[PDB]
């Protein structure tokens, strides 16, 4: 059915020189940014430190977070992408539109 409420998944990688406390704060900041722009946070995963397939700004590891959200704001994925792009601490960002049935929980 045609519907303007859409579901999205965002995955981003934080540079490994931030402290555990800074990484978790970054995640909360991304969530609050999404919440600002008319998005409801449905789900979230912390994937911890992961080896990168190939280096990024001379880094071989990074901190991965994942968040799913829903919104009627069609520009939120554009917005989030720009925000994660310009954030110097976020060295990788990926935005995926997902189905409603792909929303997870716990
Ligand atoms: Na960035």
UniProtKB/Swiss-Prot annotation:
The keyword Phosphoprotein does not apply. One of its GO terms (biological process) is translation. It holds the Pfam family Ribosomal_S6. The keyword Ribosomal protein applies. GO terms for cellular component: cytoplasm; ribonucleoprotein complex; ribosome. Keywords: Ribonucleoprotein, Ribosomal protein, RNA-binding, rRNA-binding. InterPro entries: Ribosomal_bS6 (IPR000529), Ribosomal_bS6_sf (IPR035980), Ribosomal_S6_plastid/chlpt (IPR020814), Transl_elong_EF1B/ribsomal_bS6 (IPR014717). GO terms for molecular function: small ribosomal subunit rRNA binding; structural constituent of ribosome. Gene3D superfamilies: 3.30.70.60. It comes from the Bacteria. NCBIfam families: S6. Binds together with bS18 to 16S ribosomal RNA. Belongs to the bacterial ribosomal protein bS6 family. This is Small ribosomal subunit protein bS6. It comes from Aquifex aeolicus (strain VF5).
């Amino acid at each position: 059915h045609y519907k303007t409420l859409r579901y999205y998944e965002t995955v981003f990688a934080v540079k490994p020189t931030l402290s555990e406390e800074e990484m978790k704060k970054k995640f909360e900041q991304v969530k609050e940014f999404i919440k600002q722009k008319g998005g409801e946070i449905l789900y979230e995963e912390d994937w911890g430190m992961r080896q990168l397939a190939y280096p990024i700004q001379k880094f071989n590891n990074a901190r991965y977070f994942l968040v799913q959200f829903k919104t009627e704001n069609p520009q939120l994925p554009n917005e989030l992408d720009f925000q994660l792009k310009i954030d110097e601490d976020v060295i990788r960002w990926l935005n995926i539109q997902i189905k409603e049935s792909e929303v997870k929980k716990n």
